[PDB]
Design a protein around this ligand. Structure first.
Ligand SMILES: [K+]
Ligand SMILES: [Mg+2]
Ligand SMILES: [Mg+2]
Ligand SMILES: [Mg+2]
Ligand SMILES: [Mg+2]
Length: 186
RNA sequence: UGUCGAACGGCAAGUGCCCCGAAGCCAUCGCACGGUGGUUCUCGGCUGAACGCCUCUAAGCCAGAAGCCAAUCCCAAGACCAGAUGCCCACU
């Protein structure tokens, strides 16, 4: 086993990172985020004066060490989402039947997917803001905005998986809703 | 067809036989009724290391089968219910 494995993260000036019992709270200009990491058993340390975040594993084999960079990646995603946000833009791709998408508040209704009469409905959680781009700018573009990368990507994924083609060749029939661009709000 | 003499009333033929026949029972031969949520598999994904890349997976998470569990339905305290309650008595 290795005595000491260490990962360090730098923190931007605006961000505030606090750890207490493997629970990380990240505060930026556009909100706050929380992460429950009590399943990890790592030594999380924040240096406020030097604005560094450190995660340490003591006496670890390969499996515990693999969690260090996972923790650093989660905290970095929280910092980025609390200072810039996440914006996932999905596109409706169809051959013949135009996929009709309605965004009334937090509810997404998908109609006419491959000409079907069934209505696919998604209730986006309140931490993710879903909008629909004007068709004159980009046709069939739905945008997800949020501070949490995991929540935004999960919403885009559940929208993608509501429109899977069943009982047809998948190489053909490329109809679906696919995330195209993953960028930041600011 | 016998038989009480006839008529009436019947009776006998282990319900004489034939027609119709209420009540009751009864026929998918008639009529009524037969629900709702979860945990997950296979699988597809998200975030994400290991392995500066990548990766559904290693930690975490999402969606999810006529399966499985509970709701509903049936029996139900030897499941010994210090659950509630009405009277009488005992103790007070
Ligand atoms: K999976
Ligand atoms: Mg075919
Ligand atoms: Mg007779
Ligand atoms: Mg019957
Ligand atoms: Mg990935």
């Amino acid at each position: 086993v290795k005595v000491k494995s260490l990962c360090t993260l730098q923190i931007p000036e605006g961000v505030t990172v606090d750890v207490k019992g493997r629970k990380v709270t990240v505060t930026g200009k556009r909100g706050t985020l929380t992460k429950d990491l009590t399943h990890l058993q790592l030594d999380l340390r924040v240096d406020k004066k030097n604005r560094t975040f450190t995660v340490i594993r003591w006496f670890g084999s390969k499996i515990p060490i693999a969690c260090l960079n996972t923790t650093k990646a989660h905290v970095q995603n929280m910092i980025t989402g609390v200072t810039k946000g996440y914006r996932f833009k999905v596109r409706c791709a169809y051959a013949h039947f135009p996929i009709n998408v309605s965004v009334d508040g937090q509810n997404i209704e998908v109609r006419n997917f491959l000409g079907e009469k069934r209505v696919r409905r998604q209730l986006v959680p309140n931490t993710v803001k879903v909008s629909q781009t004007d068709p004159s700018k980009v046709k069939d573009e739905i945008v997800f905005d949020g501070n949490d990368l995991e929540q935004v990507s999960r919403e885009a994924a559940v929208l993608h998986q509501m429109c899977l083609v069943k009982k047809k060749d998948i190489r053909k029939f490329l109809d679906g809703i696919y995330v195209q661009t993953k960028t930041n709000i600011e």
